[PDB]
Amino acid sequence: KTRPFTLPNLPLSSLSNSRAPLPISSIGISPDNVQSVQFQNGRCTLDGRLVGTTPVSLSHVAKIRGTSNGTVINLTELDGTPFHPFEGPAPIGFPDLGGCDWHINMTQFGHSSQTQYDVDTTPDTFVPHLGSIQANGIGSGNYVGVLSWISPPSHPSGSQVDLWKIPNYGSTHLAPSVYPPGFGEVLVFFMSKMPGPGAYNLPCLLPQEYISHLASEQAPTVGEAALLHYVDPDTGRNLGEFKAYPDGFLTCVPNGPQQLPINGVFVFVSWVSRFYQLKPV
Amino acid sequence: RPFTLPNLPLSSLSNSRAPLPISSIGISPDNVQSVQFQNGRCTLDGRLVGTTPVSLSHVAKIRGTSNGTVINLTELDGTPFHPFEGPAPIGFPDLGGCDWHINMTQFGHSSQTQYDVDTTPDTFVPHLGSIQANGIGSGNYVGVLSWISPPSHPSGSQVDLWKIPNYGSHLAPSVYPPGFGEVLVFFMSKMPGPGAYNLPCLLPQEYISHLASEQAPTVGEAALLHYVDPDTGRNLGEFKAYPDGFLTCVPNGPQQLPINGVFVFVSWVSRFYQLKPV
Amino acid sequence: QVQLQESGGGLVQAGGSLRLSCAVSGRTFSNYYSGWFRQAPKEREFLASIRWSDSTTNYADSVKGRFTISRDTAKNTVYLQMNSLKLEDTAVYHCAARRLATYDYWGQGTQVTVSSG
Amino acid sequence: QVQLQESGGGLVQAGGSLRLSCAVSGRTFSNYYSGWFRQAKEREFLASIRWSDSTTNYADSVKGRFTISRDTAKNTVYLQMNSLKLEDTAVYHCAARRLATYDYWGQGTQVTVSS
Ligand SMILES: [Cl-]
Ligand SMILES: [Cl-]
Ligand code: NA
Ligand code: NA
Ligand code: NA
Ligand code: NA
């Protein structure tokens, strides 16, 4: 702890989602039915502590590694060393997109070709918390997989894609839920377009490049909330006031943030109390 | 602002030429006298060079519209790519000496498609905004490099990831060992495919996003670094980082160092500062 | 090295017009924002920016409606069309380029002097 | 919250042995390094172990006498201290690092070596 809190001086649309390796394309708020979120990737406190399956690098985000025997995939850590089931949900980096089927692109060290692995996260065979998931036709061998595209969940039949959810890792001690804190504030999300047969937008709490910055800096959290300005890098104009909270999330008061340009920069202004009332965006 | 590097262990970081974890530190074979990678290029005062993006979400990716014969490239956010003096759109893969296999997906459509890329033919002209479709049907796609294989031409050549592709039919500059027994240092990643492929880059991607944000003034000819064990704080080896954005060491070598250490800035020094062999 | 070179300045009567140009060369990155700044003897003032790929523009309030920024992708040149010039527009005008959020590249500048006659 | 709890310290005779344990709980991350430290002036690193593959790293001062190990079912890390010396008297702490920094610390346990 040698330096006060800062955020990267980088425009948002140049940064990445922290739940999949996708560029950020917009700022968003959640639909009315979403009362909290509990993402397991993209979780980092303002003083740089990773939570959940969150890796510090995008090269580990929304990836799996393991050995298929034709019936199950026995998971490992992404570097191939053993995954030991524990109180938590899954190996570091494991995808955390609930409310959809996954289509994971599987490749191999020492073999040609790629294979699409179709993952329904709802059946009893999907237990990454215990180190295994159904092979669903993936032949025997060792693979690394990265999430490629998504589709509506296979069960319940006819349900819609809902990326505000996390999967059923168990048959679990999770990174904690994030709640709107009051004072008219709503949670702010960094959105990315996800391929697949709809207009899918994947929300996350922090760009991945913020996470690697915070994890390296480990700046002291010296107030209840960090007042930020979302700034136009050309003019320096303040486009909107936001608060970042220690657990690692941002809020604003909508007038909204979805209408803001995506090429701005979040800039730390001051530590403030949780009672600090924001000007509507 | 003082110069710093991230306080993060190397094996937790990513290659800057493909979205792959770093698995070792390496040096080049004797026949490699320089490198000219176009991704993973960032000066010590935080200026990106070449096709290098600041985020791994843009690394080794393509975007464009196939008409069944050619893919007309765009920037990765879909806005127009304008041919210019430089090599290709930001993020475009820079792995020479191999065929690429790119996983193509689409916004608003199901499925993925493997796109097989020989970078040697007359049709591979990303510098002019187009590459051969090689059977990819009409549509708009985003592609990410997935695996590689031996280059289709020259016939029988083997994979050589020290090379860059033939973008044309003005590049980030070449990087040279500076003298004094020093050799270039590379961050290596295992790349999927049928061979035992190791992809070198000059800088971890997370160093690039750090430098681009910090933009610490380059106040000397070289930055003396220590590669430090985070448990003991012991110096495992002396390295120098040079302003163009690369590291060197004097091998005794770096390939035997553990990969879970941290590079730490020690002092600005002259280019002539003599390193202790690793 | 990235090189920016302005041209087109000089003496102009108040209420008149002037077109500045900025030739960009040595560029290895395919997209960026080109910007026009000015400085009077008075900190440096941002005036206008344009994104290379899609020509998205952004203007300072001081010049909105009077100055127009544009770019020619074939000639790799950025232009500032300055109409209804005011005495207070007298300054050295600089073009600049930002790959991300910071203007890291600057031209040498071209002087613009607005006169009453 | 991540919690580390040491047990096993106390009085031990020179030339004897002591086994310390550190129970790790409340963890949401699947891999990390566990380390043992001691302090009598400045803190001294003794040993670390990587959770996934049990890779170890030892200080020269204790190599060959102390052994670090871990039980993945019990989520416990052990420091086996053999052929104890008077200079081994210190307060011993276990710690955990998710990346390069030990952010989580146990409460510490006193080890007193007598002759
Ligand atoms: Cl990590
Ligand atoms: Cl970028
Ligand atoms: Na809501
Ligand atoms: Na296991
Ligand atoms: Na389950
Ligand atoms: Na070519």
Residue numbers in the entry:
A (entry chain B): 227 to 397, 403 to 486, 491 to 516
B (entry chain A): 229 to 397, 404 to 486, 491 to 516
C (entry chain E): 1 to 41, 43 to 118
D (entry chain F): 1 to 40, 43 to 117
How is this structure described in the published paper?
In this study, we analyzed three new norovirus-specific Nanobodies that interacted with the prototype human norovirus (i.e., genogroup I genotype 1 [GI.1]).
P domain–Nano-7 complex was solved to 1.58-Å resolution. Nano-7 bound on the side of the P domain in a grove between two P domain monomers. Nano-7 interacted with P1 and P2 subdomain residues as well as both P domain monomers, which included both main and side chains. Overall, Nano-7 was held with copious P domain residues (21 residues and 33 interactions), the most observed to date for any norovirus-specific Nanobody. Interestingly, Nano-7 bound in such a way that the end opposite to the complementarity-determining region (CDR) loops of the Nanobody might contact the S domain and neighboring P domains.
